[PDB]
């Protein structure tokens, strides 16, 4: 949905 | 790719600011993460920003040490590391956290920033 | 936060023999949604650190496939079936799973020629 996203441990 | 900013003199006490300009990708697409090296070699994870809304996340031991921006019209983002010691000293890296088969890690670093903190 | 402990933490491998290097981490990196979330990264000397292998064992596309991880909930295994020169450097463990990241200290390949 164009947004960043990352493994969980990023927040 | 990134490029980071050159190599940094510090005094004791002050601040700097170094930078991670973006190219090739869609800035606001990705989170860019710090991270620090420090000269026994132990890698430590500083934080994470959004650089769509410029949120950050921040690994609690750099809370009051980092603070992490983004200028979107120059896709470049920025970490200013505040009150520094000795142990400031170190050579900082920006990753952007990519994604690759639907999974998501990093995937593209700067090259460091080396920071010596020195009277 | 988590505490990633790599063994050995020096090792020296004559080309074209087989490496490996462990880690162990102080609790489960099986995340709620099923994905562990491990990583293995190699720093040569001068470069920045790079990701071989997310997901204890998907390999990134540009990695050479003599590389290969296995692992538990816990313990971890990167093995490189025949060393090459470019094999050279620190390979560290870095868990994504719970926040915040952390890094294990990084062991060190020599090539031995």
């Known amino acids: 949905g164009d947004r960043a996203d990352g493994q969980p441990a990023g927040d | 790719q990134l490029q980071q900013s050159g190599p940094e003199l510090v005094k004791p006490g002050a601040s700097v600011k170094i930078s991670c300009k973006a190219s090739?990708?869609?800035?606001?697409?990705?989170?860019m993460h710090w991270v620090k090296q420090s000269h026994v070699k132990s890698l430590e994870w500083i934080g994470r920003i959004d650089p769509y809304d410029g949120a950050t996340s921040y690994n609690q031991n750099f809370k009051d040490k980092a603070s992490l921006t983004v200028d979107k019209s120059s896709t470049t983002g920025f970490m200013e590391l505040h009150s520094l010691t000795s142990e400031d000293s170190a050579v900082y890296y920006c990753?952007?956290?990519?994604?690759?088969?639907?999974?998501?890690?990093?995937?593209?670093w700067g090259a460091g920033t080396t920071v010596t903190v020195s009277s | 936060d988590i505490v990633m402990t790599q063994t050995p933490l020096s090792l020296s491998v004559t080309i074209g023999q087989p490496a490996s290097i462990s880690c162990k981490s102080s609790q489960s990196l099986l995340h709620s949604n099923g994905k562990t979330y491990l990583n293995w990264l190699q720093q040569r000397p001068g470069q920045a650190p790079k990701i071989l292998m997310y997901?204890?064992?998907k390999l990134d596309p540009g990695i050479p496939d003599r590389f290969s991880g296995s692992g538990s909930e816990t313990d971890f295994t990167l093995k490189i079936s025949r060393v090459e020169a470019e094999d050279l450097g620190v390979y560290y463990c870095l868990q994504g799973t719970y926040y915040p990241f952390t890094f294990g200290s990084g062991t060190k390949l020599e090539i031995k020629r």
């Open positions: 997901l204890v064992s």
């Open positions: 990753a952007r956290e990519g994604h690759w088969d639907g999974d998501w890690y990093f995937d593209v």
């Open positions: 090739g990708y869609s800035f606001t697409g990705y989170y």
